[PDB]
Design a protein around this ligand. Structure first.
Ligand SMILES: Nc1nc2c(ncn2[C@@H]2O[C@H](COP(=O)(O)OP(=O)(O)OP(=O)(O)O)[C@@H](O)[C@H]2O)c(=O)[nH]1
Ligand SMILES: [Mg+2]
Lengths: 58, 113, 49, 473, 111, 68, 89, 144, 104, 129, 483, 39, 51
């Protein structure tokens, strides 16, 4: 990972207790993704055209 | 080639530099956009021909100092540390006549208010 | 040894020793075991050549 | 039936069709009828088994208008196809041959030789099959059957089969019984023999019938080589394995029984068998009998055959293969016990009558050197059967002899109560042996002779004992 | 007293001689020092002694072996509920197994 | 120190093709190539074929499996 | 080796799972040391296959490979039922 | 291969603390971090985040080297080549010519080997020369 | 289906399958659409062949559709004049110049 | 003949036998070698094939020499007790090397192989000379 | 067959012979043979065990011919020579009442002879230097469960039976990965592990009472703090006793002084051969999981909202304290790197008991986790580069060692009465067990032990079923014939 | 039935097929031994 | 391990070489890559479920 030089930063931790006790919120509302939103849900999954999932763009 | 491969992170694979131009709604626009981007990438890559300063550095996973080197961490300032310890034992012995439990913060470690 | 890939030569007369017609015995590119008249050397030549 | 659906394709198989075709062949009643079925078997890809061979051979030999040439040709075609010959088919062909006398004698002898080879192959393969199951009794009975079947043809079971079977044996009773049976099969049933007590067996005299050149001469031309090789196989099997018996039999008794067998057979001995016999007595754990065993075996080795008659053949054999070579003499020096009141060497065909201390040990060592000289094996020219490396056994045996006087034990306190002068003479002996080793190595360096680990270690042990003597002094 | 290194029996000596022959032949995987060769030979003869021990152990256990539901022996194999569910054949299955034909029958056919 | 970067890069460019098809050349140049390659084959072929050999290539490649 | 790792590590050092993989050799009267095998998984990939159904599949694959290597091994294996396929989902 | 649990247990009823079962969301499953816990999808996503955290921490503790960027000239011959970026070409072997078949990307160089290029200003060997044992010397291991 | 035997060759492509489960007591019904790719590799650009290939959709089979993928070699110039190589400026760019909404 | 998987893996092995990273340029997933063999070659621990155990050598030599009965291969022993087949040409002729078979590899190298194979799907230069 | 009643116990001579159990337990597990002798009558019957326990021999009595053989050590000798314990998993096989077995490998013989020379080193100095290539000792490396800990235990046994000063450090994690770390009272910038230090001092003193009692302290202040009634220490044994025998927390600061002076005096000594054996030298080589305290805890604070400190808000990761900064390891390194001390021999071994990680990792369920007490150290280790000792590579058992070890395990467990016993007929024979366990373990020692235990679970062994079927059929047909 | 899907060869799941030949050969050997004892 | 990320100008090194942060900024210029300044160095998680 290339961090902006001169910026104070912390390398990923090596202990389980650090990750456990550190303040990371848990996901509570619905999940959002920058491109899986057009495809509404896993059970809905809107598709544009019936192209093969193996289809390759040249 | 090194500089161009570094600048084209995932755009290069198995010896082929590939660029998917889809910015515009027309393939006639995307051909021009891709041509411009290829020319810019090539021009920036050719900076490696100006001088060595433009040759990208190689990333070598340099090991941490080995155990043999780490051993000398115990011997750095060996004589001075021995002198200090022999001097400090006197202070420890004197302090033991006043407190049941002597403390490094009392002997050498600096814990202030 | 300095060639990045095969080098083709002139078409010489030769005789076929064998030819594995099975795809699993000739993965792409296909090869043919052929013996050349000059020097009697046997080589696996690409089918295209 | 031709398989049409995949369910029948899951059941179709050529080797399994062999079963149905064997059944139809057995059901058939006429050889001419079985011929069409067998022709169709061959036209199809049906794998020809051993049951088809048995059936065709039997129903053909019992057919009337057959020819023995065609019976044997059908057997040849079956074996050329993937058919395994069996004892039953071998017996059928054997009876057919023995009853076929109208054919030319050349053909009859050729087919007799073929059938001899067939019996030998069957015996070999069955020995191999029954080896792992530890079925010594069943294997012995099967070997009885094969031996009886070869007797009619005259030629007996061959020494290679006998050697493998003996190396595979598991108990002394059958090992000795099979050596005995080989000796008796090598001779006619009315041949004279010597009875061996405690075994209730008779060893026949076989050198009377063994082949001899009768006249350069080759070592392989003498038939004694195969018999001595089977004896060597028995000795090797004895050494390299443990027997299990409801009543265990002793090592010394078994070794003496084998010695008596070879002695009464009275066959010319070989360096290999003599050295193998001597190894056991050298490494024997009994002290008050190993000297007697060693002198007995050395007497046998020097005599050559221990045979009463035909002294010219023993001289010829000695000129041929040099019995009692360096390996045997080195093992003899290693086996002979120091301070034993028996003569170490032989004088003018010495029966080793007896000895009349520091001077006693000096006499023993000088007699050992005289024995080495009289055997004169250090002059023998190196050969391909025996390279120079064997010659190191003499120095190894001498070093072990010195070790045995250094310590009162042998492969079982630092040392005993001796004289300081005795230990000085022992140190001198160690030094002179060390230096004769140097002369030997310098002489034969052109093949890079190498000392034995026992030879090197015995000197170290003798020096350790001498040093302990010095320390206690 | 110091124990002597050399082979202590004829079988030991013969195995050491074979090991030396193999080393001279230079087949892969063989050692080159006599001490490790002697270690190899000693371990092999000890293994043979152990194998003979196992043979005698099994032959004694064959006669000590239980066959009735008793103390620490019991038919949890459904023989009481289901019965004899395991097959057991006394004939060699032709292609795989082999047992020599009986000599009474051999002689009968030959005669 | 042998040849300039231009010639070197030209050489890799020539040899880097998918298939390095050899060029057709004039007769005089073909004669020159034949003669110079005859001169050079001696330096490459082993001593046992430096004079007599059943072919110009004989000895150039060691592993060539012949027929007989 | 199952998918590039030793069996004792793939099946998490569980005796009751690896003995199924051994079974085709024993039923065939064969030494497992005379053969070296590699098992590749084309099914649903999972971090750990240390279970009885996966062991069953591995045993069946080994048995089929042994059958095709040496046909006469098919006799004891089919009789033992290592060639038979369960149909349970 | 990993024997740790990756999925969250399903909820089809209220469990109890029994011989073969334990209460859902107890302080035993994921190191006691289930005290933060609804929807199986979001719960599984949180468990996936925790598992990724564990993977990362162990993957970083396994890392004993450092990635100093060295100029091309002051570099070993094996690294004086063109190295494709990750996931761009086939895993590259260091040098098949010298029988070195090993992922070049995973090569690690001992710090007491580049003191000639690192720390060129310090004329004293900050790290003493690496002691290498002699293989061609009779030692206790080679004595038997 | 073999490139070695015929020209052009047909290669298979995985059918697009979309299963849907809905109330009826539930039912599973899936839409399916099967594909086949015809590949023609020519050692030259023939606009006549491109025309005759494009004209296929007019007599395509009933209720069957087609789409065309073209991969052709094209010459591209790198004009070093409009795109030159220059020394890296005296004051180099920092991360502020590549900030959010910096592209505009 | 061969079954589907046998044919598939025979083709894989032939491809790897004629594989070349230089000839695998400008190509998609078809340029990646036979994963298992390639990673086994790359793994260093497999670059050292242990020699036969001292016990194996001792037993083989004892049966070869002290007993005049060579040890036969499992492919060379005759199993059909009623038929005699011809020994295959490959019976005991295939040397055992750990760098060729069986396939052992490092987990990170396998991960990189898989990710690169799935990501270089469309990095193919279809039109070539 | 009931030859059990006819069996009479042999005469007890050693703890191993005392480990024998009632005949009812091992009747059939160890079948009894019968030997007929002709003593004062042609018929006699001596029912004896087919298998006897491996001999209980001293390291002096062990010989070259014993290579790849199993011997035993009496419980009294074990307690005498190992007060600190048996690091690693070696005591896994020695429950109460079990014989304390030990394999004698080629490496074990080499080490025994090397310690024999160390017993009189000053004369054999050239031999020792040639053996170690001049390095100050050996380090033993190899795969997991390979036998490094067992070899170090055997080395300590050899040295302490030969009466040489031995510093045995089992489970070097007790020192590096200890419970809590404390800065050294008298060494500035150096840290302690007081619990491990006090335990080590107790066990070392009790182990080496004789030589330590005969010892005379050379460089040690004799004004050491002392409570009423206790005599000032005059020998190294009394120094260790003063260090480790004290009331808490007065022991925490006393142990640091004791260990510092003990290390100084051991470094000074130049006449007695001192063997230092440590299990897991890589731990003492690279680092300890303890970190340096945050400087806020040292600087001091008045109120929390004043300084805006985040010590109780966010955890951090201070640099890990390297193992070189401990006082015990400081003494060891001082003695190691500093030449002019050909008196101490470091026979160390590495460890590989780290938790596993193979690309992905979830959470190991607590109840089913055989790596619960494994080390969180996934970094690689190379003994040659990470230490000054001469590396010795061990591998898995070869068939000879494996056969001997499994024979001892199974037969002695059953004889002592902890195996199948009356249920021996439920388990396959020794040859099948050997073949299967060899397959399952790859002849790895730890794997062999684990699968010997797991053999309780085998479900695809039909040998005994078929044997019972065949013998029952044979008996039934015999009875039918008899009828 | 609950286990209708499993094969009949797996219902009892016979095992130990490698011992039958050994048992046949040992029975024949013991028969020969008994005959010899009788004689 | 809390730290401050560093940077060496090509001029300062004994032999200059194009730095990786410079290459990163060149890539950002060419491809208009927005670089989030507050991206944490500790939070580098990969979705193992897919990778
Ligand atoms: N009695 C005895 N047990 C041994 C011997 N070698 C290995 N073991 C067994 O192996 C088990 C594991 O101990 P080691 O192999 O020494 O463990 P290690 O060598 O320190 O390797 P790690 O576990 O990775 O630290 C012990 O429980 C022993 O029972 C041996 O020579 N004698
Ligand atoms: Mg350990």
């Amino acid at each position: 990972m290339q961090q902006i030089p001169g910026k104070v930063d912390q390398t990923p931790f090596e202990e389980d207790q650090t990750w456990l006790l550190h303040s990371i919120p848990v996901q509570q509302l619905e999940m959002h993704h920058h491109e899986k939103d057009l495809q509404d849900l896993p059970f809905i999954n809107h598709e544009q055209f019936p192209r093969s999932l193996e289809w390759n763009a040249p | 080639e090194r500089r161009l491969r570094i600048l084209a992170q995932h755009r290069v694979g198995m010896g082929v530099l590939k660029l998917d131009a889809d910015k515009y709604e027309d393939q006639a626009d995307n051909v021009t956009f891709g041509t411009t981007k290829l020319s810019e990438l090539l021009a920036d890559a050719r900076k490696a021909q100006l001088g060595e300063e433009y040759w990208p550095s190689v990333e070598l996973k340099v090991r941490k100092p080995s155990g043999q080197s780490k051993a000398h961490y115990s011997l750095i300032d060996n004589e001075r540390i021995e002198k200090r310890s022999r001097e400090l034992y006197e202070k420890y012995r004197d302090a033991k006549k006043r407190s049941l439990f002597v403390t490094p913060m009392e002997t050498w470690l600096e814990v202030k208010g | 040894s300095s060639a990045e890939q095969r080098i083709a030569g002139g078409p010489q007369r030769a005789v076929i020793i064998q030819y594995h017609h099975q795809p699993f015995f000739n993965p792409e590119p296909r090869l043919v075991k052929v013996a050349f008249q000059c020097d009697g050397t046997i080589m696996e030549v690409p089918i295209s050549d | 039936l031709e398989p049409c659906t995949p369910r029948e394709w899951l059941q179709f198989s050529h080797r399994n069709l062999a079963y149905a075709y064997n059944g139809a062949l057995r059901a058939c009643h006429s050889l001419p009828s079985m011929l069409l079925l067998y022709k169709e078997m061959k036209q199809r890809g049906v794998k020809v088994d051993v049951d088809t061979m048995n059936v065709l051979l039997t129903r053909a030999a019992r057919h009337e208008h057959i020819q023995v040439d065609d019976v044997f040709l059908l057997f040849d075609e079956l074996v050329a196809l993937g058919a395994r010959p069996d004892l039953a088919a071998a017996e059928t062909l054997h009876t057919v041959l023995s009853h076929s006398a109208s054919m030319p004698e050349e053909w009859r002898e050729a087919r007799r030789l073929q059938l001899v080879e067939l019996y030998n192959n069957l015996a070999m393969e069955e020995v191999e099959r029954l080896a792992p199951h530890r079925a010594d009794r069943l294997l012995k009975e099967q070997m009885k059957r094969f031996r009886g079947n070869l007797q009619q043809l005259g030629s007996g079971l061959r020494p290679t089969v006998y050697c493998r079977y003996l190396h595979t044996t598991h108990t002394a009773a059958v090992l000795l019984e099979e050596v005995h049976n080989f000796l008796w099969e090598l001779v006619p049933n009315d041949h004279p023999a010597m009875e061996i007590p405690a075994l209730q067996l008779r060893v026949p005299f076989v050198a009377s019938v063994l082949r001899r050149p009768s006249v350069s001469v080759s070592r392989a031309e003498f038939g004694d080589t195969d018999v001595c090789a089977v004896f060597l196989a028995a000795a090797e099997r004895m050494v390299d394995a443990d027997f299990d018996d409801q009543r265990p039999v002793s090592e010394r008794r078994l070794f003496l029984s084998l010695l008596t067998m070879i002695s009464y057979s009275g066959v010319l001995y070989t360096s290999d068998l003599m050295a193998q016999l001597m190894e056991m007595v050298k490494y024997s754990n009994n002290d008050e009998t190993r000297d007697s065993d060693a002198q007995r075996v050395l007497r046998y080795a020097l005599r050559g055959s221990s045979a009463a008659q035909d002294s010219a053949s023993r001289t010829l054999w000695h000129s041929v293969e040099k019995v009692a070579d360096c390996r045997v003499v080195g093992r003899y020096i290693g086996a002979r016990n120091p301070w034993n009141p028996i003569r170490v060497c032989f004088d003018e065909q010495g029966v080793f009558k007896a000895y009349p201390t520091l001077e006693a040990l000096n006499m023993r060592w000088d007699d050992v050197r005289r024995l080495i000289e009289c055997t004169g094996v250090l002059v023998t020219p190196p050969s391909e059967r025996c390279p120079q490396q064997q010659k190191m056994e003499v120095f190894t045996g001498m070093a072990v002899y010195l070790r045995t006087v250094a310590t009162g034990r042998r492969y079982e306190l630092f040392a005993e109560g001796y004289d300081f002068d005795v230990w000085v003479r022992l140190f001198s002996l160690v030094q002179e042996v060390r230096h004769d080793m140097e002369k030997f190595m310098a002489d034969h360096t052109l093949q890079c002779v190498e000392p034995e680990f026992e030879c090197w270690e015995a000197l170290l042990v003798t020096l350790r004992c001498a040093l302990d003597f010095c320390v206690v002094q | 007293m110091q124990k002597l290194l050399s082979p202590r029996t004829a079988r030991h000596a013969r195995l050491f001689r074979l090991a030396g022959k193999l080393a001279d032949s230079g087949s892969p995987g063989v050692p080159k020092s006599d001490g490790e060769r002697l270690v190899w030979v000693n371990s092999h003869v000890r293994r043979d002694k152990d194998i003979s021990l196992s043979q005698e152990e099994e032959r004694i256990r064959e006669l000590m072996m239980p066959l009735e539901v008793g103390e620490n022996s019991f038919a949890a194999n459904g023989q009481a509920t289901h019965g004899n569910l395991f097959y057991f054949r006394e004939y060699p299955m032709y292609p795989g197994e082999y047992v020599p034909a009986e000599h009474n029958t051999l002689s009968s056919l030959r005669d | 120190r042998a040849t300039t970067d231009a010639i070197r890069a030209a050489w890799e460019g020539v040899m880097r093709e998918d298939v390095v098809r050899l060029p057709d050349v004039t007769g005089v140049v073909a004669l020159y190539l034949t003669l110079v390659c005859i001169r050079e084959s001696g330096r490459l072929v082993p001593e046992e074929l430096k004079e007599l050999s059943s072919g110009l290539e004989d000895g150039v490649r060691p592993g060539v499996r012949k027929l007989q | 080796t199952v998918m590039g790792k030793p069996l004792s590590l793939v099946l998490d050092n569980k005796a009751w799972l690896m003995e199924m993989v051994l079974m085709p050799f024993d039923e065939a009267n064969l030494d497992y040391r005379d053969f070296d095998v590699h098992i590749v998984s084309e099914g649903h990939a999972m971090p750990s296959i240390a279970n009885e159904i996966a062991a069953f599949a591995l045993r069946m694959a080994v048995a089929n490979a042994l059958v095709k290597l040496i046909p006469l091994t098919r006799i004891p294996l089919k009789k033992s039922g290592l060639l038979s396929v369960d149909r349970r989902r | 291969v990993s024997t740790g649990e990756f999925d969250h247990p399903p909820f089809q009823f209220r469990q109890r603390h029994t011989f073969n079962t334990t209460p859902l969301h107890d302080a035993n499953r994921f190191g006691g971090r289930t005290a933060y816990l609804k929807d199986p999808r979001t719960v599984q996503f949180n468990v996936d985040v925790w598992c990724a955290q564990q993977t990362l921490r162990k993957r970083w503790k396994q890392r004993d080297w450092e990635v100093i960027e060295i100029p091309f000239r002051l570099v070993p011959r094996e690294q004086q080549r063109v190295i494709p970026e990750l996931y761009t070409d086939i895993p590259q072997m260091t040098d098949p010519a010298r029988n070195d078949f090993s992922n070049i990307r995973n090569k690690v160089y001992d710090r007491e080997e580049l003191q000639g290029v690192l720390f060129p200003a310090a004329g004293t060997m900050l790290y003493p020369p690496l002691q290498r044992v002699d293989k061609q010397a009779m030692t206790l291991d080679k004595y038997l | 289906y073999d490139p070695h035997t015929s020209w052009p060759h047909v290669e298979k492509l995985e059918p697009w399958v979309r299963m849907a489960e809905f109330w009826t007591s539930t039912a599973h019904y899936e839409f399916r659409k099967f594909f086949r790719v015809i590949i023609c590799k020519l050692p030259f650009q023939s606009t006549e062949f491109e025309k005759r290939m494009y004209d296929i959709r007019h007599w395509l089979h009933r209720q069957t559709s087609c789409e065309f993928h073209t991969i052709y070699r094209r010459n591209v110039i790198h004009d070093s004049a409009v795109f030159p190589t220059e020394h890296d400026p005296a004051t180099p760019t920092t991360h502020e110049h590549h900030r959010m909404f910096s592209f505009a | 003949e061969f079954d589907a998987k046998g044919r598939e893996y025979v083709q894989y092995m032939r491809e790897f036998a004629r594989f070349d990273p230089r000839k695998s340029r400008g190509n998609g997933q078809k340029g990646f070698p036979f994963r298992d063999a390639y990673l086994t070659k790359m793994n260093e621990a497999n670059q050292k094939t242990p020699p036969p155990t001292l016990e194996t050598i001792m037993d083989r030599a004892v049966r070869e020499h002290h007993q005049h009965a060579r040890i036969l291969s499992p492919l060379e022993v005759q199993r059909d007790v009623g038929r005699l087949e011809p020994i295959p040409s490959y019976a005991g002729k295939i040397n055992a090397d750990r760098s060729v078979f069986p396939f052992q590899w490092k987990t990170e190298d396998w991960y990189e192989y898989e990710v690169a194979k799935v990501r270089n799907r469309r990095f193919v230069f279809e039109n070539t000379e | 067959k009931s030859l059990a009643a006819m069996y009479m116990r042999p005469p007890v001579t050693c703890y191993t012979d005392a480990c024998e159990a009632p005949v009812a337990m091992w009747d059939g597990a160890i079948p009894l043979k019968e030997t007929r002798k002709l003593k004062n009558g042609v018929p006699v019957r001596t029912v004896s065990r087919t298998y006897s326990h491996p001999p209980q021999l001293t390291p002096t009595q062990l010989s070259f011919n014993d290579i790849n053989s199993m011997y035993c050590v009496g419980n009294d000798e074990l307690i005498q020579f190992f007060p600190e314990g048996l690091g690693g998993r070696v005591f896994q096989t020695m429950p109460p009442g079990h014989p304390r077995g030990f394999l004698y490998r080629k490496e074990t013989h080499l080490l025994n002879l090397f310690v024999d020379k160390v017993q009189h080193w000053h004369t054999k100095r050239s031999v020792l230097s040639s053996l170690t290539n001049g390095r100050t000792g050996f380090i033993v490396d190899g795969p997991t469960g390979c036998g490094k800990s067992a070899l170090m235990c055997q080395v300590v046994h050899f040295a302490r039976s030969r009466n040489i000063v031995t510093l045995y450090v089992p489970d070097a994690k007790v020192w590096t990965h200890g419970e809590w770390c404390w800065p050294s009272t008298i060494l500035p910038g150096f840290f302690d592990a007081p619990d491990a230090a006090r335990s080590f001092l107790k066990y070392f003193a009790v182990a080496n009472r004789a030589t330590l009692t005969s010892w005379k302290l050379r460089c040690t202040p004799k004004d050491l703090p002392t409570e009423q009634g206790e005599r000032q220490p005059q020998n190294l044994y009394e120094l260790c006793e003063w260090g480790h025998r004290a009331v808490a927390p007065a022991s925490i600061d006393r142990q640091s002084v004791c260990v510092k002076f003990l290390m100084d005096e051991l470094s000074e000594e130049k006449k007695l051969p001192v063997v230092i054996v440590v299990d897991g030298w890589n731990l003492f080589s690279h680092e300890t999981h303890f970190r340096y305290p945050h400087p806020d805890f040292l600087r001091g604070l008045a109120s929390f909202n004043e300084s805006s400190t985040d010590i109780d808000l966010y955890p951090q990761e201070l640099p890990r304290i390297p193992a070189s900064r401990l006082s015990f390891v400081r003494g060891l390194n001082k003695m190691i790197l500093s030449g002019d001390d050909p008196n101490k021999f470091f026979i160390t071994c590495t460890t590989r008991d780290f938790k596993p990680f193979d690309g992905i990792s979830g959470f190991p369920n607590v109840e089913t986790d055989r790596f619960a007490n494994s080390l969180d150290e996934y970094a690689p280790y190379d003994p040659e580069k990470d230490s000054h000792f001469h590396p010795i590579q061990i591998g898995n058992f070869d068939e000879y060692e494996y056969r001997s070890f499994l024979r001892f395990l199974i037969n002695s467990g059953e004889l002592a009465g902890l195996g199948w016993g009356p249920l021996w007929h439920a388990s396959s024979d020794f040859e099948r067990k050997l073949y299967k366990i060899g397959f399952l373990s790859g002849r790895n020692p730890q794997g062999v032990v684990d699968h010997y235990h797991q053999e309780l679970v085998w479900r695809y062994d039909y040998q005994r079923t078929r044997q019972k079927q065949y013998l029952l059929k044979r008996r039934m047909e015999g009875m039918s014939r008899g009828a | 039935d609950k286990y209708r899907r499993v094969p009949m060869l797996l219902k009892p799941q016979q095992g130990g097929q490698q011992y039958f030949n050994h048992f046949l050969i040992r029975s024949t050997n013991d028969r020969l031994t008994q005959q010899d004892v009788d004689n | 391990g809390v730290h401050r990320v560093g940077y060496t100008h090509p001029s300062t090194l004994p032999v200059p070489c194009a730095q990786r942060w410079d290459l990163r900024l060149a890539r950002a210029r060419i491809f208009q890559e927005y670089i989030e300044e507050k991206a944490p160095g500790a939070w580098q998680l990969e979705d193992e479920r897919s990778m």
